[PDB]
Amino acid sequence: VEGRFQLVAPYEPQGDQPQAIAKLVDGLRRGVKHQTLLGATGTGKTFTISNVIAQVNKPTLVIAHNKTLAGQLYSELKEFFPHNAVEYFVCYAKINDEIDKLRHSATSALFERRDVIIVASVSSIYGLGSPEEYRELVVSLRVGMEIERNALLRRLVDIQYDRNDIDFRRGTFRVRGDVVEIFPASRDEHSIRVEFFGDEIERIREVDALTGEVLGEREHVAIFPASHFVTREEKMRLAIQNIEQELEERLAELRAQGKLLEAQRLEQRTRYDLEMMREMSSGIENYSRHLALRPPGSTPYTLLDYFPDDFLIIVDESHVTLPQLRGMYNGDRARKQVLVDHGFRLPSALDNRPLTFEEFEQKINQIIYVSATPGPYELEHSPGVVEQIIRPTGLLDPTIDVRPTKGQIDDLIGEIRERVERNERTLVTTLTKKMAEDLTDYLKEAGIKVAYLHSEIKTLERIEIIRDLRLGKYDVLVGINLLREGLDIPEVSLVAILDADKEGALRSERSLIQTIGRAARNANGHVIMYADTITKSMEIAIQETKRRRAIQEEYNRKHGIVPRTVKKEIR
DNA sequence: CCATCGCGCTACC
DNA sequence: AGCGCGATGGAGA
Ligand SMILES: [Cl-]
Ligand SMILES: [Cl-]
């Protein structure tokens, strides 16, 4: 590889992926800042993007709008680039430990090699100190280097590695006479064995700690700090002093106001935190601004800042991701402020925050937004769109009937019964938790095996219910707004949309396309809208569905593609 | 106004 | 593992 991406896949680009790839790549090479990939559900957008990443060879940040999508994209990208550094940067016993490790693998990789793709959630790009410091404080070790064992040990301690001769673990180092064995914070199962002859480095080896294999000799190795908030001792002392002076003034302020409970609470928690500013703390991010000695109101350091300046950003499901990004500042600021009011945190804790949307914009080099339904921001900043409509599988956008509200529930049930005999599944979407609840009984009353999906349901149980649906424990799934982007269930032939004309965010153009899209994974995919009116949003959804289907049907007969329902392994 | 998300605190265990 | 709190998309009083 040598710092270049190698896209590995069992197939090549198909349908209209080639032109999509070509346009985006061209756009990047001409210095176009914002671009948008208008890719229909099931056109392999991640593969399209991977080809794009592979050709331009920039360090890439992939931003998902939740952990589930981040996880999937991470595992997909790992398969696509098995010889490159695909990393995973999400927020927070051993599950916590694994996340800390993966975060460290991600940041250190940005300073080890160019061929790096990091998948992060939009909420998880924080919790970091200066990248300049992170790099500057590396312990760089070379063979031949004049250095004492005890001095190397001291330098490792200063960057937060613990001596631990008994345990064999991440973020520690072992000592046996002349051999020091370092486990980087970024590795669970790999260590660096450093061998001294007198006060000189005779040999450096990479070791597989699980298998015990010695993997090779190194002339040079780089050990990165075991925390992202490490600073030099002088800077650290001054941080401590600033924190102490701030605490004094706020404690006096709170007491002057007769908020003695709050003052007590603040003093107690802060002192406790300061206790471990000698010993090792948790929640240290709250002091980030003082630790960096930076001005009040300063933009925080983020994952974006660890990337080089010529990096690439991919925003997955951009229409949801960007508004989530936009609203985080005000949301976080308001929660933190009440914590400051009740004396849980110092006022400087407000500087431990997400970026404003404007700050995010300042940090962009080049960006590609990815959505089947791009938001207005994406369209306004991108010069038109790179459209991608033809599926390598041949599958077509579904057919749509509009049917009236009268006896709709009886109509739906009969329609569903036909699917069960065809061994096919159905998805239904109502407006409210109430109606969904009623409807799910109606169906249980009529003997239909059905499950109900709503916000109260939890990740692990959601997963279970999707799985059971695919397995055939259920034939129908009912929900409100969770039968949407991300949902990939090829056994679904029917998507029912109740109150399809009852306008709002739930029945917007954008939402209709997304919900319709759940029918685009089956060769017999069909959508029924239960409405007495054809609304404008409805009008546009149906027309766009029709337009795509027509183009795809022509394409399919020009090239002799047979729409095949993608068999997808059940996990 | 509704469904849904994610975040720290507290009342739990 | 559960509270209250403010986000969000888009029409509504
Ligand atoms: Cl010793
Ligand atoms: Cl534009």
Author numbering: 1 to 92, 113 to 300, 303 to 593
Which of the paper's sentences describe this entry?
Within this complex, UvrA acts as the initial damage sensor but hands off the lesion-containing DNA to UvrB and dissociates, leaving UvrB bound to the lesion in a preincision complex, the precise nature of which is not known. Both UvrA and UvrB expend ATP to form the preincision complex, which is believed to require threading of a β-hairpin element on UvrB through the DNA duplex. UvrB presents the lesion-containing strand to UvrC, which catalyzes hydrolysis of the 5th phosphodiester bond 3′ to the lesion and then the 8th phosphodiester bond 5′ to the lesion. UvrB is classified as a member of SF2 helicases on the basis of conserved helicase motifs (I-VI) (Supplementary ).
If the UvrB helicase domain underwent rigid-body movements similar to those seen for other helicases as proposed previously, ATP-dependent domain closure would force the F-loop toward DNA, perhaps causing F527 to intercalate into the duplex stack, which may function as a “ratchet” to facilitate unidirectional translocation upon ATP-hydrolysis. Indeed, in a structure we determined of UvrB (S91C) bound to a fully base-paired DNA duplex, F527 is intercalated into a sharply bent DNA duplex; furthermore, the crystal structure of the analogous complex containing a F527A mutation revealed substantially reduced DNA bending (Supplementary ) and increased DNA disorder presumably due to the loss of “ratchet” that seems to lock the duplex DNA in position. That F527 intercalation is important functionally suggested by the reduced incision efficiency observed for the F527A mutant UvrB.
